[PDB]
Scaffold this active site. Structure first.
Site, PDB file in Angstrom:
ATOM      1  N   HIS A   5      14.888   2.908  -6.857  1.00 18.42           N
ATOM      2  CA  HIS A   5      13.777   3.510  -6.104  1.00 18.42           C
ATOM      3  C   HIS A   5      14.050   3.828  -4.633  1.00 18.42           C
ATOM      4  CE1 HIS A   5      11.295   2.407  -9.610  1.00 18.42           C
ATOM      5  NE2 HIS A   5      10.436   3.301  -9.153  1.00 18.42           N
ATOM      6  N   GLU A  77      14.699  -4.674  -4.932  1.00 19.30           N
ATOM      7  CA  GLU A  77      15.868  -3.818  -4.704  1.00 19.30           C
ATOM      8  C   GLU A  77      16.642  -4.177  -3.429  1.00 19.30           C
ATOM      9  OE1 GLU A  77      15.224   0.396  -5.474  1.00 19.30           O
ATOM     10  OE2 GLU A  77      14.269  -0.006  -7.381  1.00 19.30           O
ATOM     11  N   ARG A 220     -14.555  -7.973  10.988  1.00 22.50           N
ATOM     12  CA  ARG A 220     -15.780  -7.625  10.272  1.00 22.50           C
ATOM     13  C   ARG A 220     -16.966  -8.500  10.690  1.00 22.50           C
ATOM     14  NH1 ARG A 220     -16.258  -7.680   3.647  1.00 22.50           N
ATOM     15  NH2 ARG A 220     -13.993  -7.802   3.949  1.00 22.50           N
TER      16      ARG A 220
END
Lengths: 250, 225, 250, 225, 225, 250
Positions: A5, A77, A220
């Site tokens: 990838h 990877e 928040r």
């Protein structure tokens, strides 16, 4: 090329054994710029890689993408490519009222509200950071003069219902997550993000070292909204912390 | 401006009520090119979005990224902007001996081996596709003479370990294929009043040509407007 | 005789490869009557079987009994007897206010609130209907002019607490099912019944085709009570649908 | 008088905000003997408690008994009396070939194979140690020249069947050691705003001197006052 | 008229506070025939019910059908009509070498391998029989000189796959027998203030006369009025 | 000596095949005193053992400690030592308003809110008492004239949150146990304790006989507080029951 990838060969890394892993490919250049001789390696999907030097040793900076599945690909990877230490940099909201925008969070372990981690260890296994990485991050933060909070992060497979957000199309959260935010708040959880449960579990179960730092860009639970420039200044500080942490881990 | 991740406004959609959601930006452009008046809207992180027109009605094409978590963000934020029907197209391997490279798979329901679907409904709830979307995908596949199989897909958070990469229970149970996104997509839409369909082209089979699936998803979209 | 509960031999079926499966043995004759040359095969416990002809091909009508355990017995033995397509006919209540008495429901998949299905596939596996069966049922309904709803059904091992009924001897429901009805309502679930999770899971996991249709005879969420004759007329229509669906599947 | 099990009052603690919690009363006396002005306070059931002084500040030493359940009682009742930091010391076997008898293990987090931790937080929450306590234990071990390993410990309700006594998944995953108390202790403190650390001396290893761990826990305590 | 399935009114019961609940209608008639003034009340679906009299008190006999789900309907609807004690009689195989064909099994508690029990109590709650009912069944068995074993029964939703029909953990754990109804029955009554007992006659044993169990359940009923 | 925690050899037991098992070593002498020739065997941690005689047969009295882990050790080693029947004696609070201080509870089975039991059988297996032991306890209670309640006990790995206590340092209980007490009350559960799920499950799954009796010394649901002497008199009665039960089991 050597991996399926990232589009990278082993030699591309030039023996690099530590990697800094942001989520957003946009942040890869600016972090590599902090270091010596920044060179763009590859860019495939949301996996953008740059290589640099720090105190003479090669370092990699690679984006993970969003979520555990994407992250697992990146970590797997890069581990194949020889990376043995992973430092996650992020920007985050807080879930505690006493945590302020511009503060820095270093994560000791994560609440595993995700799926990909379970492929690496059963749920009983802790999504715990490496002690050396955590120590380096805490020390780099303090050297910079940052206001630092060290503790547990909640790591979710979703941005909306797993973070108990109600301002959505449906306005509903499934029973599992109804009242969940108040629960984590009471247990001392610092913040929500979406990648660490996979990162920390896969590293802790596979003999690899990982840590995570994040700059608080929003809260928040606070009424005041964040300034425009203070969010950009928190991001640069967090970047500074992660590079200075990496210097101690080489 | 209206959503957290996608960088889109309601107005950008010009009344669009259907989106096509592949995983990757290269596939997005390819899909939009099949339709009328294609326009790129935005590109942030994993989410690259184009707008286009089908029979004089607006449609969006938006990449999801890898896995349920990124998929979940894309679908929610598109739903907030007014989309009520989602069609996913992918390319996959098959795990059944009679399924050929070149065949088309329409998923009726998914095995829920992901983590994100559980953020929408408990495990007992079916990761089932909408009947209209499923019908329209099957119709459109027959329209271009595709060899079509219709059934269950297995959906997981891992690409390698959750696909046999150095257990054959899914084959014995009649599962067609493996991928990573459909469980989240189907569960999240079916449990929230949104329609969803899923189609894939067979690119490999361990027991033994992608432009077709792209045409099929577009022609399915047309039938659902 | 060839099987352990139904009292049937293979030859009794006369090569029949489709079966219509009501729950109540009382309904077996009246459905077989819709077809050519209806003959009573056997009647053992709640397994009453009749054979008939449709467009020249032999068809079976067999009762399942109540619940997944009973149903699994019926399906298993009929599969042994050569039946490869199963169409469930039922009458049901609705759980959505906009679904009216006299409407018809075709089930795409089921919420698995039962036990027997787990013996055929793990919980992750969907209790999904066959596409051809579902299509035939939807088309037969529309040809008859029925008001049709296509979607998810909740399938429960109990009539009372699993359907969140409180007008019971104890007046209590266990935490798992407390607030459960409101949850399914919000998720778009059409109705409750007790047999489909087993039927659909065992067929989908074993290379057999199954579908289900039901006439709405009551609605718990509506104040108006159903008429006496309209319940009997909804039942006959549902029967008509299932036979006309079967004609397309032979 | 103030608590259900321990037989202690707030006043007995004389302002103590740190407790050392080994499993057994013989170990309690040994630990308190290393400090200034040791005094036995009480002995009821599994819970034998001493008070002592470190740098002019009061510290408590209290035995937990066997397992999460008894441990849970001790920690809660000490917390009610004002303790906010807990350090556990034990002695264990190791399951890693490079860990030697005589080495010291500092636990960062535990595998949650107990029942009592679930009474405090769902399984997804990490049985993680406090950073300050972990640092202080590592510092104090280096101070006396101990050979130190820092990592994960497996924590179960059984001594024999949950330790291979007539699966090697924990070894392959890098687990250092087995014991019975740390999962409850770490989870119960981390989910309730209390600091906790855990240290052990290696007494056996199937792939191949306890006073040191006792000195280390005391010297760690000092750094945390 | 008073209940959804059974076709019974309160008045039909004439003050009955005990019911005997076998699986099948042929067994119902057989049981009622042992008592005074037997009368058939109703027959709908799986539920065939008779009324009879024992020591001048009314008792009901009602078939359950196959499995927890049908059993659950029968017990609930009888409870609504005033029954507070339930005794089940069955016939089964045994899985223990010392249990002989002809022996009688009184179940103290069941392994909960059904789905319906979970609709009444979470898995941690025991599928336990009432002490009085268990005692009365044991007394009545000794009364007619039956060879009696008292212990645990395994209760599942499947007849074949959940009984070894082409794992020996239940045998090693001392389980007497397999059936399909007792887990639901015992859990549903014990968690809702109703008394329940369970008795069976051994008809087969893979390691190696039903009228007796029927007489025993009737004579047990008598002791519980 | 022959075992790894109790400090006992086989011959020390003198052929004893029944043991009485209190939790508190303080209660071991006073129970052994009820019987002939009470001799102190050993005392190691919370495992204090005494031997005595009853109707000519040797009997053991051994403390278990607190919680399932401790208990499993005691039961396991005593089973190794030849003990085949275990009678638990305790003092307990009640969770039902109609259960009074001074009443006696005999446990038929236990709700398994613990961890150690799962090492002996899966959760599906019932934590059930032996019928002979239960019968002997019920008969000894009635012979003494005690007001007796026979039924289910909830067995917890914690004294505080698993018993839904809120008067704690944090004042919070995790969602699993929030509202749990009201649930058990509605299901007919008599009381809470901490050892029986392990005791009963390990005995029932291993061919050993076990039972449990307890005197009620307090009731959380009653406003009146217990008298000082009545708690001590309830304890002596419970002791009397367990010895008289043991006489029938020899």
């Amino acid at each position: 090329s050597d991996v399926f990838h990232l589009g990278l060969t082993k030699n591309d890394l030039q023996g690099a054994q530590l990697a800094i892993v942001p989520g957003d490919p946009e942040r890869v250049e600016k972090i590599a710029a902090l270091m010596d001789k920044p060179v763009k390696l590859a860019s495939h999907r949301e996996f953008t890689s740059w290589r640099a030097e720090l105190d003479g040793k090669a370092v990699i900076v690679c984006s993970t993408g969003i979520g555990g599945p994407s992250t697992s690909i990146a970590v797997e990877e890069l581990a194949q490519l020889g990376i043995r230490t992973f430092l996650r940099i992020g920007t985050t909201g807080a879930i505690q009222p006493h945590i302020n925008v511009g503060d820095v969070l270093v994560t000791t372990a994560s609440v595993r509200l995700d799926g990909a981690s379970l492929h690496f260890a059963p749920m009983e296994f802790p999504a715990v950071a490496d002690f050396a990485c955590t120590t380096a991050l805490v020390e780099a933060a303090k050297s910079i003069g940052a206001t630092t909070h060290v503790g547990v992060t909640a790591s979710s497979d979703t941005f909306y219902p797993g973070q108990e957000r109600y301002d959505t199309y449906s306005g509903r959260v499934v029973r599992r997550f109804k009242g969940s935010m108040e629960e984590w708040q009471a247990m001392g959880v610092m913040n929500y993000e979406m990648e660490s449960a996979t990162l920390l579990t896969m590293c802790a179960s596979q003999g690899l070292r990982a840590g995570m730092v994040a700059g608080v860009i929003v809260n928040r639970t606070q009424q005041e909204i964040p300034n425009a420039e203070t969010m950009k200044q928190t991001e640069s500080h967090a970047v500074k912390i992660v590079v200075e942490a990496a210097r101690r881990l080489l």
